[PDB]
Amino acid sequence: DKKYSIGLAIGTNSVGWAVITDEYKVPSKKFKVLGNTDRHSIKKNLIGALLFDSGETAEATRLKRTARRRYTRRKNRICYLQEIFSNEMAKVDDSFFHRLEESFLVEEDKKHERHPIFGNIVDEVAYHEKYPTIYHLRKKLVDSTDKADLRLIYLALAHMIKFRGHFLIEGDLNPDNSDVDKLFIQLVQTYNQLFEENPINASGVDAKAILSARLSKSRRLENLIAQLPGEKKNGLFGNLIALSLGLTPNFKSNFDLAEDAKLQLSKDTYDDDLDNLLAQIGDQYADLFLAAKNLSDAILLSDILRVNTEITKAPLSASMIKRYDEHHQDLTLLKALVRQQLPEKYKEIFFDQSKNGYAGYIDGGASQEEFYKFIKPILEKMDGTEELLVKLNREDLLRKQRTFDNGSIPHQIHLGELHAILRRQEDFYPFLKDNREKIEKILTFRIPYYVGPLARGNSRFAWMTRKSEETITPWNFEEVVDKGASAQSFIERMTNFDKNLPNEKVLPKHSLLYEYFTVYNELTKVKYVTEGMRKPAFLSGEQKKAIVDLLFKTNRKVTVKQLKEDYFKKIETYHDLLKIIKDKDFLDNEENEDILEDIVLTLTLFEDREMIEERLKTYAHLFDDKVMKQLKRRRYTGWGRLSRKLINGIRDKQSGKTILDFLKSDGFANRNFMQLIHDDSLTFKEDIQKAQVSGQGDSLHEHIANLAGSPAIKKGILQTVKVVDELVKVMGRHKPENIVIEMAREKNSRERMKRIEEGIKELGSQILKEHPVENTQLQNEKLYLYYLQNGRDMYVDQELDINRLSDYDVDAIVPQSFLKDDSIDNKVLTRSDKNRGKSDNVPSEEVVKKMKNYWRQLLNAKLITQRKFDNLTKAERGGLSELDKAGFIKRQLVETRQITKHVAQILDSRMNTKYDENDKLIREVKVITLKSKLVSDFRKDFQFYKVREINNYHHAHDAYLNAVVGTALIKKYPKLESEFVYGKATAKYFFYSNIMNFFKTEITIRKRPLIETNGETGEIVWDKGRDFATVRKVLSMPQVNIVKKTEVQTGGFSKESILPKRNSDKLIARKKDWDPKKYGGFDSPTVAYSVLVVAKVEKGKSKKLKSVKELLGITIMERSSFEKNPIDFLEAKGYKEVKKDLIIKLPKYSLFELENGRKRMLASAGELQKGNELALPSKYVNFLYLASHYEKLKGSPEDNEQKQLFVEQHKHYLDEIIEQISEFSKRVILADANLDKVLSAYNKHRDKPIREQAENIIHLFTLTNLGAPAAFKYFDTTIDRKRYTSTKEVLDATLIHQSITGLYETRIDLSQL
DNA sequence: TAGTACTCTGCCATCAGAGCAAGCACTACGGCCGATTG
DNA sequence: GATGGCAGAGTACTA
RNA sequence: GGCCGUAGUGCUUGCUCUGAGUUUUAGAGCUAGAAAUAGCAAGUUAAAAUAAGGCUAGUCCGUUAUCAACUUGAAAAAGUGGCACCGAGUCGGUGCAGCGUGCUCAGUCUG
DNA sequence: CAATCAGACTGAGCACG
């Protein structure tokens, strides 16, 4: 038995641990080794770390799941259409659908003719000649009036149904509205006709260009307003224009309606909102609103159709046909031009599929951007290509019909085309006449987002409820699915429970009881003071009732003057429902509170008007039709944090009064919620405690999963809990005195590009147009800041130069000393940092006044954030006060993160379990949490420098230093237990500035005593004479238990790319009947785990059985098949007489010990990884840190000078570091060619400065590392990977099974078996 | 000599968007919210 | 972003 | 620490959808050529699959989390490994074990 | 409103296995 402590450092992919005794010495004990080897014991130190791969989020899995569901539903739609057509298609050509299904088949596999539509070569060729694309067929069917072949009708309908289009725009679209100017003129005419007193003139205004601009919608509206006299924004005409172009205007000010009456044109509720507005004002604005709707349709369509729709009913098909024709003409013209001018490049342009060009554009995979990049210079270096170059510049040269930009086509266009086809062809096909509604339903149906998957009790994600047990098709979806219950369950499965009553659901935020509760809490804490009062007094129950009835039940906002006048002078959600139902006695009654709760619950739950009105039909008799309509109109959003049972259901045992009852009857006490619930005498606390006891706690893994945070952090937490338990078991089941823990704080380029594009569009500038920047270039911090600041200085009014970058200075708004935040939200790029003023405070008031307008504009442009703006304009608010500075200094050392709170609580609950007589938990184990700042400062101050590139020992060293610092600190300052152990401005500032000054011998010059004592107690907390030597000795130990957590690979079967056909055995069939050698397939499977099999194989013509020992990679696809029957799985692979007992399962990162301590880790069944750590001396580590200037220089000039001299005298340490690396590589790495290249590079770059040489030597440790080999770079010379691609040598080595700390092992010698 | 059989080296990885709902964590403020004895 | 798969060129040993 | 009021940012989980992309087949290539080969013509589209697949047969499920070895259990789970000292190139060596009960004394804590 | 002699453990000596 010995008092000991555990120090832990938690990372996303590493967890270090350390056990220390009283004198800060790490123990060392012998451990028994199990297995068949002759080694039965081994000595190890209680210091180490566990490394694992980072956890992942379920986002990719969710995306894959949704895609799978989408594909299934699409096939179901096509099957519905085929089922509709089946009888007549069997009459016409019975094998048509069979031919369609087997199109993906070689000729010998088809049981029908190869041609899929007509089945004979003449007919197929004629059809393809007449309709080169499906859009030709679609336009012909839409426009022509004669009979069409049934197969052709089905083909057009199937294309339309299979590829519908986006559902962003709701309602109906009329493609005939295409002209922008004509509809703008019509709208102006209607406006002038109605508003005769103040007519509006818009002649001479480029309405088409203004409205169809590529800028933002708000910018377009502003431009149109500026170029339009007689009105501005928020006027009637301005609101009409905004409504047409898509913004949501408030028509309240136009007619003084006093209600918002906002209308959105794309929303489904637009018709109801317009009906309400028309009933409010009058019926004479219907023409104007209809004109606005037509203008909106034209505005949104003209950007897509780009064709005249007055002659055809298929505008999209006409656009695709003209795209085809322009493609054809441009191709002919380009062929002629190339033939005439550059005959030698014709082959490489129109025949070579590898290089980009037309051949690679059509036959190859090259996209439109790549084709344009290839073909622009050739067109430029030719004559007669001006119009082709113009089309290229506007991105309209040689365009395919199916492209990426086709995603902006609403499904309403396809629906209109399909309806036109059905209307044309229903006279000749009665079945087409009959099934028109259901075919259109097939095209336009989509499952509501709140209904979810239509399961039948075998899905964990589903929540839908069926009122009838039968197959759900799009035609009886309403009559089978209980939509209201499905939506309510959709909302309720995600809402929280009350924390005080864990089995109780929370109330809606706008619930009436919630409103009364909040108002009563606010009212009971206001102490009135008036004449004739000796001391301030609290309001009584009757006074509060009178005040609530007279003020709260009358006016929305209650103020102190109103309280004094209407009650103290005159005498001495509720309002929203009052103006809707227009009933005061009903709302003030007490027997309809359940009805009111139901009403607010419905309005909160359902966002669809039909659902709200069908749910409220039960209360339709209580009110009138207009009241019901108003109730449907009103909708609330938000959920409270308190349950109804907690607020009003539970009652005190002594008095039989609920919390609301007590709050109403507070009287002179005026005790609030927190008080009511924390009172010892009151039974509310006891009842709350009783409820929380029920359920208790789930498993540790379940609790960690239920925590909120990153999955990688949760994985690290679980590993830390397990290693703590393992160490407790190791140390004899004696729990430690203290557990000191710490936790690290932690396409992006595409996000930056979209953000800058949106900001530039909003601001109306053209900085991107001046010089475009790619995402990779935008990844640079200086460039990103320059582009975010619109190319202008942020502290003074001047212009910055992009070509002059890498020369300015990046200045943080809050100085780095107070807060260490390096994010863009705190960084600012300016020409000179001195413009900000003082360097130890917020930017100066003069600069704030100068740049307030610019910063406001940037915020409105979303270039900077609200927090950034608030930080920048803090000088006006008052700047950085002394209390703020003290808080910033204090928060740099005291951990306050909820994740670390949780972690500490879990460890505390696991460790301390006993209770006293008075049910007071005994703090046997004290959990101390520190930030990384304390340990980092300790390392910098006392020359315990950390270099991350040497090896993985720094995790264990950090854990040990955490233990030492935390234990020493809580011994020296026992009063600091409040802020560290889980369980004035000037004075606070200088207290935390020197909190760690008892470690050091000298301060600022203060001669601190050699032996540090607690004071008031006889405890020695530190001894600079010998404890520093102990820490140095511990950090220089060569043995540290580093464990790579073995895992079984899970995930995708292989690479998702589908390769073309080739005669290789590595291809994987995409379907059971699709031979890879004839259809192509996947490759590169992921190996779940290797299996060691000792068996015999048939070799040679005689098929003699040769005993073989080898590793077999059980891939993810065949893992279940293997585990179901290993014998059959292995026999089918070709091995005979395998041994079930001798089969060994070998997951990833399995460790093997071969010779001279050389260790290899199993990367896969045919690859290995390095498994050895270089224990470089701390003298070499310190020299490398000092010479390399880690984190530049952060020392005094006097101290900086002596370290430079130290490096100068220790020049020769470089050769020894190289010597250590070389001998380690010779003993373990065995990469001879790479070692020779590294040594040659070192010899050739010997004359360069020590700084540069050390900086490059840091890279050489990538050669001698643990894990997968990686390529590094020494100066110019680059050294590639030396991969170990053979697992044959490990079959005679020693397989080590390491526990979670590595102290418990089971060595299995595979050579014997 | 032909045929396996193992080794070294370079290439290569599905990608973009649209809503909706619930929750947490943090920032920035701006107010209320620790017990015992006479 | 990297790290394992794969094709291809290359060299070596045995029937 | 929580609960209100406002505002903002980021992240997580779940659902309904969109456009592409790859793979095979269909869209008769021609002429001079014994043959390779050469010269022309053409190119834009569609069908099907989009993790193999599963049984629970649903317009459902299939890439998250969890997982050293051994023993006992169907499983969930529970068990399995002596200590001190001197040292340090991935851990080595040395030493001990493999004391219990009654009386007096003296020091510390509680009634 | 104002104050914040009995039981257990360790070491020392003697007796028995």
Author numbering: 2 to 573, 593 to 766, 775 to 1011, 1031 to 1051, 1057 to 1365
The publication says:
The sgRNA region consists of a guide sequence for targeting the specific site and a scaffold for interacting with SpCas9, whereas the 3′ extension region includes a reverse transcription template (RTT) followed by a primer-binding site (PBS). Here we present cryo-electron microscopy structures of the SpCas9–M-MLV RTΔRNaseH–pegRNA–target DNA complex in multiple states.
To validate this hypothesis, we reconstituted the SpCas9–pegRNA–target DNA complex without RTΔRH and attempted to determine the cryo-EM structure of its pre-initiation complex. A structural comparison of the pre-initiation and initiation complexes revealed that the positions of the PBS–NTS heteroduplex are similar in both states. These structural observations indicate that the PBS–NTS heteroduplex is formed to face the RuvC domain, and that M-MLV RT then recognizes and binds to the heteroduplex to initiate reverse transcription of the RTT sequence.
